[PDB]
Amino acid sequence: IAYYTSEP
């Protein structure tokens, strides 16, 4: 999971 957005 990206640390900079939750958007897929």
Epitope: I1, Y3, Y4, T5, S6, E7, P8
Partner: single-chain antibody, 251 residues
Framework: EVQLQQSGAELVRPGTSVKMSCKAA????????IGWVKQRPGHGLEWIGD????????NYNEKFKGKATLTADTSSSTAYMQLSSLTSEDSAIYYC??????????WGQGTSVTVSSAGGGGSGGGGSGGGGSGGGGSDIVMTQAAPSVSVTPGESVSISCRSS???????????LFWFLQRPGQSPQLLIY???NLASGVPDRFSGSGSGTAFTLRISRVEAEDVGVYYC?????????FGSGTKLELKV
Amino acid sequence: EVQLQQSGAELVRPGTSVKMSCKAAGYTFTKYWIGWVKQRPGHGLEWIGDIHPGSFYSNYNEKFKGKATLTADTSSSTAYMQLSSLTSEDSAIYYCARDYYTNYGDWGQGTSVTVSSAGGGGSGGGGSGGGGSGGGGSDIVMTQAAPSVSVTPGESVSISCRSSKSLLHRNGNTYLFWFLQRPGQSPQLLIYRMSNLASGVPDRFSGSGSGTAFTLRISRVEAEDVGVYYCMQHLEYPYTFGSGTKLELKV
């Protein structure tokens, strides 16, 4: 199991502030985004923002800029939301939810905030904050055409939603979610990425769609299916919900 434990109800005067907590158990706190949701009677569900307790990156719905401030304390695995300068529009139940690969599957029990002249002095001032956002263009409008639907028990029903743009991602997934909120409960995730059944949800529930139009089909409706069904898009910030479809039994 994953648990999110939220702080106690607040009853506070106009003009005060509150700071509420969401204590996380059962998973790695610094790995997953936590989102916050406002449930105000007559106003469905509304997405506030999210935060990554590992990086402290945060993103806000612009509607809440100057209203909500999100923080996290990794020493106690606790996330916080401060609401500043409270008005009667802020009276609502506020939820935290863990974002598991875009699925808001784990929800806190909610913190009730009631603004009233007969209330207290609140938590006191604080870090009023900021952090957003999506690109700053148009938000995705999620429309549920029916505010309610009445069904005979054991018969089946369709709940409809549509999005103002396609929710189809280039990875092939369609970022559409269905939630049910029963009386006195937190929202429950039913279907994730358009057609995937969430753990522990009966396979009486089915999700389908085109990309811009969607159907939650509830086969053989039971008493435990009564509540408000919401669609939500998790494609782009800010995340947005439909206005909700109340299912009632015609018993």
